[PDB]
């Protein structure tokens, strides 16, 4: 290499430690890496930032995938990459995101009921964000309450941001993945959003279950809530790899009493409400009978009073506990 080149870039390069104050402020320890709440030392910002140290050294598939994708993606409801630091000393990669004080896991935790303006608001921004990613053929692959971040106090008050933190919960996994379908689809994301919506309506994970792709008990719970699919409800259930195993272990008559209406009635939600009717098009067993994100957004549930608010909290006081350090 040229020496003048090395030293000039070295001199000019922005460093993580120089521009950000983060030691002691570890907010999450994910499978892809550790996440920090980062204050900007250099003057002009009282705004906080989420700083991510990518696990491993160098540019792993994980690192290259995340950088590449999020450097292109731009939507209010998808989480936004502000800056990348490449630290030559130890070959570690750091990513700078906008800090999100809340998430749907801690919000749903706290109410153990949510206002309905808030539920509808939260759902619309998830649908909005997922639609954008889906238009760009970007599948999430693991949507759940802890990946739906919500922005606390400041310029983006109450705005949902969709993320992927990383890490056993098969509670949000569509039944085709339980019957062993090979590929992830857009329909797989939408199932998980239906699960999130039911949970927002009632505070209980709709397909909660105790601790191969096949999972007997996760399936049983789905069937306990939704009832066993009839042939006509899902004609290509027969094409699934674990369909023989399904027919061995299960009997449809076990679930004759069971349906979505009866589960949701039991948790004080009316089955002729627009809320419920959209929930059923989301939680449809057959993926090809499951509506799209665009279609959910057009649903008249979002025209019925009250309308979706831009601010999920609708002006009100944010009563939720802030993030604890680790």
């Amino acid at each position: 290499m040229d020496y003048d080149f090395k030293v000039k870039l070295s001199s000019e390069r922005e460093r993580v430690e120089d521009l950000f104050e983060y030691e002691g402020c570890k907010v999450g320890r994910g499978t892809y890496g550790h996440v920090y709440k980062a204050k900007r030392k250099d003057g002009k910002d009282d705004k906080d930032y989420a700083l991510k140290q990518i696990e491993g050294t160098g540019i792993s598939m994980s690192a290259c995938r995340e950088i590449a994708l999020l450097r292109e993606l731009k939507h209010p409801n998808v989480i936004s990459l502000q800056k990348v630091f490449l630290s030559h000393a130890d070959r570690k990669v750091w990513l700078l995101f906008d800090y999100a004080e809340h998430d749907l896991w801690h919000i749903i935790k706290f109410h153990r009921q949510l206002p309905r303006g808030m539920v509808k608001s939260l759902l619309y921004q998830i649908l909005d964000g997922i639609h954008y990613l889906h238009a760009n053929w970007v599948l999430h692959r693991d949507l759940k309450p802890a990946n739906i971040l919500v922005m606390g106090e400041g310029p983006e008050r109450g705005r949902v941001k969709i993320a992927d933190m990383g890490f056993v919960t098969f509670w949000y996994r569509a039944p085709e993945l339980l019957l062993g379908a090979r590929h992830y689809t857009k329909a797989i994301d939408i199932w998980a959003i239906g699960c999130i919506f039911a949970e927002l309506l009632t505070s209980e994970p709709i397909f909660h279950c105790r601790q191969n792709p096949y999972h007997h008990d996760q399936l049983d719970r789905i069937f306990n809530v939704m009832g066993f699919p009839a042939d006509k409800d899902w004609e290509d259930i027969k094409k699934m790899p674990e369909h023989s195993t399904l027919m061995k272990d299960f009997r449809r008559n076990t679930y004759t009493n069971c349906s979505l209406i009866k589960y949701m009635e039991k948790h004080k939600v009316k089955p002729d409400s627009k809320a419920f009717h959209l929930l059923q098009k989301l939680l449809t067993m057959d993926p090809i009978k499951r509506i799209t994100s665009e279609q959910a957004m057009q649903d008249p549930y979002f025209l019925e009073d009250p309308l979706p608010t831009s601010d999920v909290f609708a002006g009100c006081q944010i009563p939720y506990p802030k993030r604890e350090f680790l």
Partner: protein, 268 residues
């Protein structure tokens, strides 16, 4: 099924940052033109474009990965000088990183270096007497410099997708595609991919393919909606490169040309 960010070009980092103005490109080139003629600089570009194609072929990577590795290489030396990082080191680094981006995986530390070494020895001994001097730690270091200069812009759009879409629309895939595809490959010998949107390059290559095989597509083209003055600029560069190709003996000239490249200054 479809590929990620397929229809996002107009809001893409490619478009918004890596379509450069030509005058700015030729300005930054003047550093290396004190050591090389105009003619000699483009001959290098062709040469290292062939280095990259051979590497990709030895590794059995698809054509889209080779084009992405080429665009990274071009991006790098569009901004910085040939002395900055040895382009012998940069070329296999561009293929390495591109292979991770297009989702074909990490090339093995053994395989990438055996690839580099075997291709320079077999296909390029005319320009390279000595064996491939770099090891994987030099690749890893370079990759870090590559990702920095590109401002982490990794997704690259190319002319191959819109080319297929146009020829499907013509109804001539068997007749015109094989040739049009080959002209698209050849455009990577030039600066075009840093100066025109990939769809426009596609049209230009499709036009040269039509003239070559004598297919009249006058009205199909006029029925499109685009600055034809721009498409004519590209067609002129493509025609130009085939005269350059004709007059250039890569094998009989490149060792001398490589010796004239500016030297990476060492530490004191």
């Amino acid at each position: 099924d479809d590929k990620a960010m397929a229809g996002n070009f107009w809001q893409s980092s490619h478009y918004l940052q890596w379509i450069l103005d030509k005058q700015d490109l030729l300005k930054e080139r003047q550093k290396d033109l004190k050591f090389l003629s105009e003619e000699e600089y483009w001959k290098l570009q062709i040469f290292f474009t062939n280095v990259i194609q051979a590497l990709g072929e030895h590794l059995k990577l698809r054509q889209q990965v080779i084009a992405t590795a080429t665009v990274y290489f071009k991006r790098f030396y569009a901004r910085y000088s040939l002395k900055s990082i040895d382009p012998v080191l940069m070329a296999p680094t561009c293929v390495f990183l591109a292979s991770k981006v297009e989702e074909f995986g990490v090339v093995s530390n053994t395989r990438l270096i055996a690839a580099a070494t075997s291709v320079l020895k077999t296909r390029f001994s005319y320009a390279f007497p000595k064996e491939f001097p770099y090891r994987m730690n030099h690749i890893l270091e370079c990759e870090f410099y590559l990702l920095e200069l590109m401002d982490c812009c990794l997704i690259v759009y190319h002319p191959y997708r819109p080319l297929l879409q146009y020829v499907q629309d013509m109804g001539q895939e068997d007749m015109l595609l094989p040739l049009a595809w080959r002209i698209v490959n050849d455009t990577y010998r030039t600066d075009l991919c840093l100066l025109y949107p990939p769809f426009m390059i596609a049209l230009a290559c499709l036009h040269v393919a039509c003239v070559v095989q004598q297919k009249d597509a006058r009205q199909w083209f006029a029925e499109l909606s685009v600055d034809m003055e721009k498409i004519l600029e590209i067609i002129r560069v493509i025609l130009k490169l085939y005269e350059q190709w004709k007059n250039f003996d890569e094998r009989k000239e490149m060792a001398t040309i490589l010796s004239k490249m500016p030297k990476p200054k060492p530490p004191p």
